[PDB]
Scaffold this active site. Sequence first.
Site, PDB file in Angstrom:
ATOM      1  N   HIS A   1      17.381  38.831  36.199  1.00  0.00           N
ATOM      2  CA  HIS A   1      15.923  38.366  36.569  1.00  0.00           C
ATOM      3  C   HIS A   1      15.780  37.900  35.352  1.00  0.00           C
ATOM      4  O   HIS A   1      14.248  37.295  35.548  1.00  0.00           O
ATOM      5  CB  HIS A   1      15.551  40.225  36.549  1.00  0.00           C
ATOM      6  CG  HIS A   1      15.612  40.967  35.131  1.00  0.00           C
ATOM      7  ND1 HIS A   1      15.944  41.814  35.012  1.00  0.00           N
ATOM      8  CD2 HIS A   1      15.279  40.487  33.711  1.00  0.00           C
ATOM      9  CE1 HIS A   1      15.730  42.604  34.032  1.00  0.00           C
ATOM     10  NE2 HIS A   1      14.846  41.779  33.619  1.00  0.00           N
TER      11      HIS A   1
ATOM     12  N   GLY B   1      12.413  43.270  26.051  1.00  0.00           N
ATOM     13  CA  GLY B   1      13.948  42.979  25.725  1.00  0.00           C
ATOM     14  C   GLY B   1      15.549  43.740  25.338  1.00  0.00           C
ATOM     15  O   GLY B   1      16.594  42.866  24.879  1.00  0.00           O
TER      16      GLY B   1
ATOM     17  N   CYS C   1      17.172  44.282  28.122  1.00  0.00           N
ATOM     18  CA  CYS C   1      17.752  43.869  29.011  1.00  0.00           C
ATOM     19  C   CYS C   1      19.124  42.832  28.809  1.00  0.00           C
ATOM     20  O   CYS C   1      18.797  42.353  28.027  1.00  0.00           O
ATOM     21  CB  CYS C   1      17.153  43.292  29.613  1.00  0.00           C
ATOM     22  SG  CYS C   1      16.020  44.369  30.870  1.00  0.00           S
TER      23      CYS C   1
HETATM   24  C1  LIG Z   1      14.134  43.821  30.151  1.00  0.00           C
HETATM   25  O1  LIG Z   1      14.223  42.446  30.402  1.00  0.00           O
HETATM   26  C2  LIG Z   1      12.716  44.964  30.558  1.00  0.00           C
HETATM   27  C3  LIG Z   1      13.338  46.309  29.746  1.00  0.00           C
HETATM   28  C4  LIG Z   1      12.616  46.898  29.889  1.00  0.00           C
HETATM   29  C5  LIG Z   1      11.518  46.798  29.611  1.00  0.00           C
HETATM   30  C6  LIG Z   1      10.564  48.205  28.748  1.00  0.00           C
HETATM   31  N1  LIG Z   1      11.176  48.595  28.295  1.00  0.00           N
HETATM   32  C7  LIG Z   1      12.381  48.712  28.825  1.00  0.00           C
HETATM   33  O2  LIG Z   1      13.280  49.093  29.668  1.00  0.00           O
HETATM   34  N2  LIG Z   1      13.150  45.044  31.757  1.00  0.00           N
HETATM   35  C8  LIG Z   1      12.098  44.466  32.335  1.00  0.00           C
HETATM   36  O3  LIG Z   1      11.637  43.615  32.391  1.00  0.00           O
HETATM   37  C9  LIG Z   1      11.889  44.535  34.169  1.00  0.00           C
HETATM   38  C10 LIG Z   1      12.496  44.203  34.775  1.00  0.00           C
HETATM   39  C11 LIG Z   1      12.336  43.361  36.629  1.00  0.00           C
HETATM   40  C12 LIG Z   1      12.463  42.332  37.342  1.00  0.00           C
HETATM   41  C13 LIG Z   1      13.171  44.320  37.166  1.00  0.00           C
HETATM   42  N3  LIG Z   1      10.783  45.373  34.899  1.00  0.00           N
HETATM   43  C14 LIG Z   1      10.421  46.975  33.992  1.00  0.00           C
HETATM   44  O4  LIG Z   1      11.194  47.432  33.850  1.00  0.00           O
HETATM   45  O5  LIG Z   1       9.052  46.751  34.600  1.00  0.00           O
HETATM   46  C15 LIG Z   1       8.352  47.499  35.530  1.00  0.00           C
HETATM   47  C16 LIG Z   1       9.525  48.574  36.187  1.00  0.00           C
HETATM   48  C17 LIG Z   1      10.464  47.569  37.459  1.00  0.00           C
HETATM   49  C18 LIG Z   1      10.396  49.225  37.593  1.00  0.00           C
HETATM   50  C19 LIG Z   1       9.427  49.690  37.160  1.00  0.00           C
HETATM   51  O6  LIG Z   1       9.051  51.334  38.037  1.00  0.00           O
HETATM   52  N4  LIG Z   1       8.950  49.708  37.108  1.00  0.00           N
HETATM   53  C20 LIG Z   1       6.950  49.036  36.552  1.00  0.00           C
HETATM   54  C21 LIG Z   1       6.924  49.934  35.248  1.00  0.00           C
HETATM   55  C22 LIG Z   1       5.750  50.958  35.261  1.00  0.00           C
HETATM   56  C23 LIG Z   1       5.658  51.386  34.241  1.00  0.00           C
HETATM   57  C24 LIG Z   1       5.875  51.917  33.469  1.00  0.00           C
HETATM   58  C25 LIG Z   1       7.225  51.154  32.832  1.00  0.00           C
HETATM   59  F1  LIG Z   1       7.636  50.431  32.147  1.00  0.00           F
HETATM   60  C26 LIG Z   1       7.064  49.889  34.862  1.00  0.00           C
END
Ligand SMILES: *[C@@H](O)[C@H](C[C@@H]1CCNC1=O)NC(=O)[C@H](CC(C)C)NC(=O)OC[C@@H]1CCC(=O)N1Cc1cccc(F)c1
Lengths: 301, 298
Positions: free
Chosen positions: B39, B141, B143
């Site tokens: 991603h 950040g 990931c």
């Molecule tokens: C690394 O790029 C990042 C790590 C995240 C950021 C906050 N804590 C982490 O562990 N991951 C992301 O940006 C992903 C990217 C997508 C393309 C997979 N997105 C992400 O983690 O946030 C959206 C997530 C995806 C699953 C989910 O349920 N969701 C929505 C969400 C809703 C409420 C709170 C929340 F943190 C996420």
Amino acid sequence: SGFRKMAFPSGKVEGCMVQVTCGTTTLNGLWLDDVVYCPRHVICTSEDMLNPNYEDLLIRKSNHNFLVQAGNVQLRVIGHSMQNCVLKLKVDTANPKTPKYKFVRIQPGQTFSVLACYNGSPSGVYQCAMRPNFTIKGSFLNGSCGSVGFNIDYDCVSFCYMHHMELPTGVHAGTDLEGNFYGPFVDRQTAQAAGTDTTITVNVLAWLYAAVINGDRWFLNRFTTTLNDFNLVAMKYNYEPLTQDHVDILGPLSAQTGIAVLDMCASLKELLQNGMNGRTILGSALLEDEFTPFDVVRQCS
Amino acid sequence: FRKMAFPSGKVEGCMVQVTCGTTTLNGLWLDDVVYCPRHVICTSEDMLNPNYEDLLIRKSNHNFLVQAGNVQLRVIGHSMQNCVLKLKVDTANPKTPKYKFVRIQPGQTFSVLACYNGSPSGVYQCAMRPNFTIKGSFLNGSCGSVGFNIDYDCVSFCYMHHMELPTGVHAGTDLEGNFYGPFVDRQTAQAAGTDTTITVNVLAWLYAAVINGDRWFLNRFTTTLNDFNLVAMKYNYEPLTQDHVDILGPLSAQTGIAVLDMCASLKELLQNGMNGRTILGSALLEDEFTPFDVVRQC
Ligand SMILES: *[C@@H](O)[C@H](C[C@@H]1CCNC1=O)NC(=O)[C@H](CC(C)C)NC(=O)OC[C@@H]1CCC(=O)N1Cc1cccc(F)c1
Ligand SMILES: *[C@H](O)[C@H](C[C@@H]1CCNC1=O)NC(=O)[C@H](CC(C)C)NC(=O)OC[C@@H]1CCC(=O)N1Cc1cccc(F)c1
């Protein structure tokens, strides 16, 4: 709760670990530049340990009596001295993996990472808090002496602990890297008692700030207290009194939440006097005291 | 008795920064290949339903900025394996350890090296939950941070971080890019299945409490395996298998407590609670210590 004990990455310390042997007694040492630091009781036979005369024991030692190894590779010792309870072995090779470093003496309540080592080989890393009675709850086995505790600021390693012994209650005691023990303890194999331990008030306050940051703030009130009044109450509940330095290190969390330190002290005092009454804070009925204000900011930011 | 992570230095030497556009995360640099979450190639308009094969074909090697410290590594090739991007670079990492890629089972534990902008920030133990989430500490950040175990000098990579769920738990993949759990690398709110407690680990931790002097929870009662498992499932604990009982032998021998006798204690705790008491400092039954974890520390 969303919080776990997180250690610092250990690699910069792993690159400094060696073993030091006298006879059949092997413990760990810390190799920085051309000096190896280790506990002075490496020079003690089992019979020397009840009552050692370290000065007398050391004058009988020569450089060629010390086996210092990085892995299986011997490092030649070219000088030796004692500083308080640590031995300094000058070696003929400067460690190429020496990080930027400082030797710091931490205060009770502060946390640090321990790299548990045996025969110079790292086993594991975990976060410890220095209790108010100057002991830590480690996981230390035979051969662990000389394992160190540290914090890492911007690639600078601040070494704060070197391991020396276990007390009857199973907690652990040691020195800073200048060889001065934390607490009243001495490196002789005699019966020693840790003082009765107390709760680390400054860390409980950090934990309440953490709860507030996460939206869990039922325990905030409209009142405040003086630091003296709070300290006299806290001691009745086996909580540590606050110092000015404690008030200072809560500054950043106070600014982040807008809750004055003394107002949070008033909320804590009410929890102590009235109890939780079935409520929870960050999921728990009990207050956590092993997260410092820095730990909280590290995990929330 | 503490949660103990593996020393992280062999993994620190593999972490780099990977950037595509305005997205930056971490990569794992082994020999001449950098592994990271695919991603990184997504924008905003991409996040909600990314056709990754489509997005990847529109990328060139020079769109990927890989930095080891302050030195850029030139990308000479790229491919995708499930949800992991593999970037071939022109430089080999001399700090590459002996390693394997393993897919771990629910209930197993591993160390996480949390990293930001290619820089290691913290290390802690996690378990793969039965519902295939992990209760991590991961911020924006993080990931591409990885999870791993160490055996002898061999690093077994088992986890790469991709996402956070609304409940605050975390999800990711093995190093082949396959998710643990029913999750998908799209920016949508995803829920996990109902979690359960890792029974073999709670039992390991009770044995650790005994070793260190805690015995208040033991009892005279006994139980059959089947009857323990009926009570366990009632309380959303995982079943205990005969392999689990076998695995707990060493701990049973060391303490003189039959596995099924410790099952009887746990049954009592589940039915009565801890009555204010604590075990090893906890008001709750800890389930993220495996039998191996307890032993390797006792
Ligand atoms: C690394 O790029 C990042 C790590 C995240 C950021 C906050 N804590 C982490 O562990 N991951 C992301 O940006 C992903 C990217 C997508 C393309 C997979 N997105 C992400 O983690 O946030 C959206 C997530 C995806 C699953 C989910 O349920 N969701 C929505 C969400 C809703 C409420 C709170 C929340 F943190 C996420
Ligand atoms: C160094 O590797 C080793 C580390 C020990 C081994 C087990 N756990 C540890 O933390 N340290 C020692 O062996 C010290 C060395 C002396 C010279 C200080 N000795 C030690 O710990 O002896 C037992 C201690 C000494 C002070 C004391 O009161 N006491 C009694 C005691 C307490 C608990 C268990 C035990 F066997 C003895």
